[PDB]
Amino acid sequence: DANSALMELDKGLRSGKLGEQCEAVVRFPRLFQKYPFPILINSAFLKLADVFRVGNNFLRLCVLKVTQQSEKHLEKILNVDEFVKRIFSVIHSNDPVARAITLRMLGSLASIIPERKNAHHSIRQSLDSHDNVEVEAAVFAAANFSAQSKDFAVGICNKISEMIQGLATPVDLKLKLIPILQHMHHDAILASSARQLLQQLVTSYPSTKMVIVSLHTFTLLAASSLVDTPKQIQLLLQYLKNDPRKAVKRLAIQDLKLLANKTPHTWSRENIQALCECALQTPYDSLKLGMLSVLSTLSGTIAIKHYFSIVSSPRSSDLVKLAQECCYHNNRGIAAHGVRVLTNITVSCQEKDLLALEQDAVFGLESLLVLCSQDDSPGAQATLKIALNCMVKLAKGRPHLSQSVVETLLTQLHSAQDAARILMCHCLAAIAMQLPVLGDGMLGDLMELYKVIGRSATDKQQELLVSLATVIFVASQKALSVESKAVIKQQLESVSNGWTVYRIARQASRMGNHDMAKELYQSLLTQVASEHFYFWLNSLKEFSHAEQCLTGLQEENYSSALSCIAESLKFYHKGIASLTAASTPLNPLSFQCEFVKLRIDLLQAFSQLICTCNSLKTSPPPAIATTIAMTLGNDLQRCGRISNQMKQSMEEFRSLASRYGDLYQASFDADSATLRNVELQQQSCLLISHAIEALILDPESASFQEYGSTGTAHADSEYERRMMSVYNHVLEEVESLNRKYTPVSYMHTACLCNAIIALLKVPLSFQRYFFQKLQSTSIKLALSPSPRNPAEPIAVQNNQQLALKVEGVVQHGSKPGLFRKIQSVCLNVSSTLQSKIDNMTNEMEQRVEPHNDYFSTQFLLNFAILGTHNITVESSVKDANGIVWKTGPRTTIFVKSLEDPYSQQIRLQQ
Amino acid sequence: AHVWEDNWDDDNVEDDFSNQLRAELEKHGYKM
Amino acid sequence: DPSQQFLQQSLERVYSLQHLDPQGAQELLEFTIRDLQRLGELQSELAGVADFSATYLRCQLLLIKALQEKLWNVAAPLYLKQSDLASAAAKQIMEETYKMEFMYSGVENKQVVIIH
């Protein structure tokens, strides 16, 4: 079929009409991107070279555009000498247009022929011919060959220097001729010669149109060949200070931005000081804006430590004065970059005198808040989002100013005109997500803004409603007030979309307000339309209801606690049934079902453990004293059937922790928050395991003290902080009670019950990968043995070997590198005796690295067994930093095994 | 960068499943 | 010798800017690593010494990342699984020290005792 398409396109080429010839020629790139077969590519390219050697110049332009489009397949071309011989053989024509087209095609073939001396020579000769269109085509071809070669670059730099000094050709051709010197980053001496040439060029031609391209090529040359970055920076600062052309100064802006973004650590203190003096001495607001953007980028980078590295007060440093005056300048963008500089320097450096800068920065910050709150322009909203970035960065870096900045943002919530409110609601949601006290400090005013929403907004009511409901949940992280949620329901039933109120419900499930979540899921359940949607909402409703029941818990009451556990477990059972109902072959809720099943099993283990804790007093010490002597107990020191059940519970909990590790390593696709949350659940399980192991079982053999750092507030969630504090509490209690009592477990059961009660008092946090999933990556992993279309086993002679030829192609549902980028694929293959040491001899694994998104690997299996065997493979996708991440299909192939009749006869004779 | 990184509330980020739910539930557009 | 002078200047920059935040140390190390790698590609006679100092800085960055791992923040008795970027770092850092000792041609005992 591919061959069929090939020669029918060849017949279209052999057709008389140049229209149809153009048709087939421009049809080739589709065939290249359909059939990557290299012999087909080579033959198609050879026919292209033939028709280009004899075509009527419009076919030639079509072939040129075909090459320039499907450039990426060029590297798999075999008959390079013949292809280049035709394409170069049409350059002796007298038609300047044909010569120009041919030279452009040589510029396109630069990827496969970068050494052709005759091509070099033809380009260099046509570079100083007179026909205009071929002169600019020669310039383009030199611009490509100088990129993928070096000796051609030194020839062209000599020729270009000669031409520019030789004064022929007009200024437009000089503009075309300058940018060749960007590709001079192959050696330092070429770089220095070109640098001297460019300095001479700028001093020789003081024109704006000259200087702009000269400076831009010079700076790309230095940024590539990063040896003369200080000379580049000081030259640019000279031209920013001295040259009065405003456009040239804007070039200096947009170039120092590039240098600051690429190589920040090369920026020096005198460079910063000179730029600061220029930014003070400038009269123009726009150029000051550009310089302030440059200083903002440099302040965000590391170079602020260079500027404030000692071996002159920081206040005596000229940067601070400029930053302050421009933050309090009238113009909005100038103020935005000033407060950016202030935020960056405050978070970055910590000296004794910077507290005044902190206060100045925060006060100018609410200045920007009021200005952007009542400006209502697109640029105003951009500067507003900049200010909110400053907020998040300042509050996270320094927790000292948190209460002040939150109350200022609440005053702006009073004083806003319902456009910026969504943005600062997101920002203050972040800030309260870090520090919890910011919500229960001022619960009331956010509810007041919530009640004025309905007659306050008309356009993005849904968006601001969702945001402010998110932050009211964050504020009422504790038990939500019935009156407050009734008001919420009143406004939602007044004006809301179903998708809107669904998003409020999802945020409620995220934070942990499960009663409100239950109500919203009940309403959405009563509407819905479709079946898996109904079952999904119903399951969510049941988990919200069970979590409500779990939050309905009393401290130090074990009977009521186990009753609540039983009720919540009934409701998870209903929910998990409805979740399996929602499950479909498409979008299969694997993570969701498995995670909620593991939560179910954790709570079942908790109920069993507290039941055995209560049954500790069910005469187990009496059974031990009746079966054996209490003194020097034969089964155990203070032996117990209860201790046997403790051993069972410890092993069960460890298995549960292993399943959590399995769930995480099979998930692999979630973000940092969700993966962290699963790690915390496994942390809780292992905490219970270590507690029951180090307290009920042998404490002398335990001998474990938590002599390590714990309790730091580097967490990403208040939920995480709460579980971590519970962990610290349990560790300190078990470390206190490690050696106090005998194994009869007098108050050991009380300590375990306290740990259980705390771990269930911290409710839950339903999370993002349990909800909307991103970076859906997959491995197809098609093996290619002898093809077993049915389940018929594959016969092998069993005397030689067997080859496998496994293949895998990786696919991505979106931008693949959202969180984790695939690096290597550890395939793992093993055998098993299907007809019953389980054929675990061949335990191969191979780490193939996919250079492209397709890979293949050959495996050899050896076996001399009569029976059928199953062969299993695994993907073991291992990421950039290096993690196991057990994902992949794990497919199996049946293999038969028969033997030679001559071999069987010889064995019978044996 | 955006104002808040852990933002579940954004349009183009959300995937196919509750895109279909969005289509249905925007068609519905009310709660009792 | 602009290339040699620049290499010396970048190395002394790192040596002087040692006394700062672990995060800023991480970005400075990454920047200088890709810088010296670019120089080793760029020239030929400085390629060996450039790559040698570059893999030494990679060594140091690897150890600092292993120290700044959150395992130390988390309490001792847990040590869950798969967070052992510290352990993978230890294996890679030992292999790089062996490589850095033997695959290179000119090494003197000052460098050798630094390696050890």
UniProtKB/Swiss-Prot annotation, chain A:
Its main location: nucleus. It holds the Pfam family INTS7_C. This is Integrator complex subunit 7. It is found in: Nucleus; Chromosome; Cytoplasm. SUPFAM superfamilies: ARM repeat (SSF48371). The keyword Mitochondrion does not apply. InterPro entries: ARM-type_fold, INTS7, INTS7_C, INTS7_HB, INTS7_N. Keywords: Chromosome, Cytoplasm, DNA damage, Nucleus, Phosphoprotein. GO terms for biological process: cellular response to ionizing radiation; DNA damage checkpoint signaling; regulation of transcription elongation by RNA polymerase II; RNA polymerase II transcription initiation surveillance; snRNA 3'-end processing; snRNA processing. Component of the Integrator complex, composed of core subunits INTS1, INTS2, INTS3, INTS4, INTS5, INTS6, INTS7, INTS8, INTS9/RC74, INTS10, INTS11/CPSF3L, INTS12, INTS13, INTS14 and INTS15. The core complex associates with protein phosphatase 2A subunits PPP2CA and PPP2R1A, to form the Integrator-PP2A (INTAC) complex. Interacts with NABP2. The lineage of its organism: Eukaryota, Metazoa, Chordata, Craniata, Vertebrata. Signal peptide: none annotated. One of its GO terms (cellular component) is INTAC complex.
Swiss-Prot record, chain B:
Coiled coil: none annotated. It is found in: Nucleus. It comes from the Eukaryota. Expressed in limb bud, craniofacial primordia and skin. Disulfide bonds: none annotated. Component of the 19S proteasome regulatory particle complex. The 26S proteasome consists of a 20S core particle (CP) and two 19S regulatory subunits (RP). The regulatory particle is made of a lid composed of 9 subunits including SEM1, a base containing 6 ATPases and few additional components. Belongs to the TREX-2 complex (transcription and export complex 2), composed of at least ENY2, GANP, PCID2, SEM1, and either centrin CETN2 or CETN3. Component of the homologous recombination repair (HR) complex composed of ERCC5/XPG, BRCA2, PALB2, DSS1 and RAD51. Interacts with the C-terminal of BRCA2. Component of the 26S proteasome, a multiprotein complex involved in the ATP-dependent degradation of ubiquitinated proteins. This complex plays a key role in the maintenance of protein homeostasis by removing misfolded or damaged proteins, which could impair cellular functions, and by removing proteins whose functions are no longer required. Therefore, the proteasome participates in numerous cellular processes, including cell cycle progression, apoptosis, or DNA damage repair. Belongs to the DSS1/SEM1 family. This is 26S proteasome complex subunit SEM1. It comes from Homo sapiens (Human). The lineage of its organism: Eukaryota, Metazoa, Chordata, Craniata, Vertebrata. The chain holds residues 36 to 67 of 70 of the full protein.
Swiss-Prot record, chain C:
Disulfide bonds: none annotated. It is found in: Nucleus; Cytoplasm. It comes from the Eukaryota. Belongs to the Integrator subunit 4 family. Component of the Integrator complex, composed of core subunits INTS1, INTS2, INTS3, INTS4, INTS5, INTS6, INTS7, INTS8, INTS9/RC74, INTS10, INTS11/CPSF3L, INTS12, INTS13, INTS14 and INTS15. The core complex associates with protein phosphatase 2A subunits PPP2CA and PPP2R1A, to form the Integrator-PP2A (INTAC) complex. INTS4 is part of the RNA endonuclease subcomplex, composed of INTS4, INTS9, INTS11 and inositol hexakisphosphate (InsP6). Interacts with BRAT1; interaction is required for the assembly of the RNA endonuclease subcomplex. Component of the integrator complex, a multiprotein complex that terminates RNA polymerase II (Pol II) transcription in the promoter-proximal region of genes. This is Integrator complex subunit 4. It comes from Homo sapiens (Human). The gene is INTS4. The chain holds residues 608 to 723 of 963 of the full protein.
